[PDB]
């Protein structure tokens, strides 16, 4: 069988999206990028990325903390929950605004 | 506003999928990979990748050709149409089985 019916590529040939029933979509164009180092660089620190690596390495990631997003108009507090997925080898980061 | 509600990461912190209304999904886990060099290496040749680079470089990609997929049970012929997207800077590869 054919894996894809239509594949969307950038000018370098890298896959953006595809149709196969099955669709790959990435409206923010972040899939494959590193969350800590590329997409949300404020998280690239021992207080966030550090806790992620610890939980991955221990095999038991389940940590919750508050996080400040500095802005031009003052910091915004969010609640972060990082947790290993219940099925398979992957991890979820949940972000919710506090109050 | 918050860009993501839930982000799925691999053990290295690379983004697999996300929820934001907006969802990023990649069931084949190929977004961000190179179509010609990683995902479909048989296309990494002047007869396919070469035509893609030509059309991207010329600014007018619109080429159609037949392509053979060797298998353990004999080759399968497909029809390939590569075309620049009508809106924005991206390119579509369409693959259809011949007859």
Residue numbers in the entry:
A (entry chain A), B (entry chain A): 25 to 44, 48 to 126
Give the text the authors published on this PDB structure.
One of the most promising protein among various FAPs is the so-called FAST protein (“Fluorescence-Activating and absorption-Shifting Tag”),14 an engineered variant of the photoreceptor from Halorhodospira halophila – Photoactive Yellow Protein (PYP). This photoactive protein covalently binds a hydroxycinnamic acid. However, the replacement of several amino acids (including the key cysteine responsible for covalent binding) allowed using it as an FAP with a group of fluorogens. In this paper, using NMR spectroscopy and X-ray crystallography, we have studied the structure of fluorogen-activating protein FAST both in the apo form and in complex with the fluorogen.
Through the whole of our study, we crystallized the FAST protein several times, either in the presence of various ligands or without them. Surprisingly, we found that the protein adopts a form of the ligand-free domain-swapped dimer in crystals under a wide variety of conditions. In this dimer, the first three strands of the core β sheet (A30-L33, I39-N43, and T50-R52) are exchanged with the corresponding elements from the symmetrical molecule, forming together one large twelve-stranded β sheet (ESI Part 3†). Contrary to X-ray data and in good correlation with reported previously, both forms of protein are present in solution exclusively in the monomeric form (the determined hydrodynamic radius was 2.1 ± 0.1 nm, which corresponds to the 15 kDa).
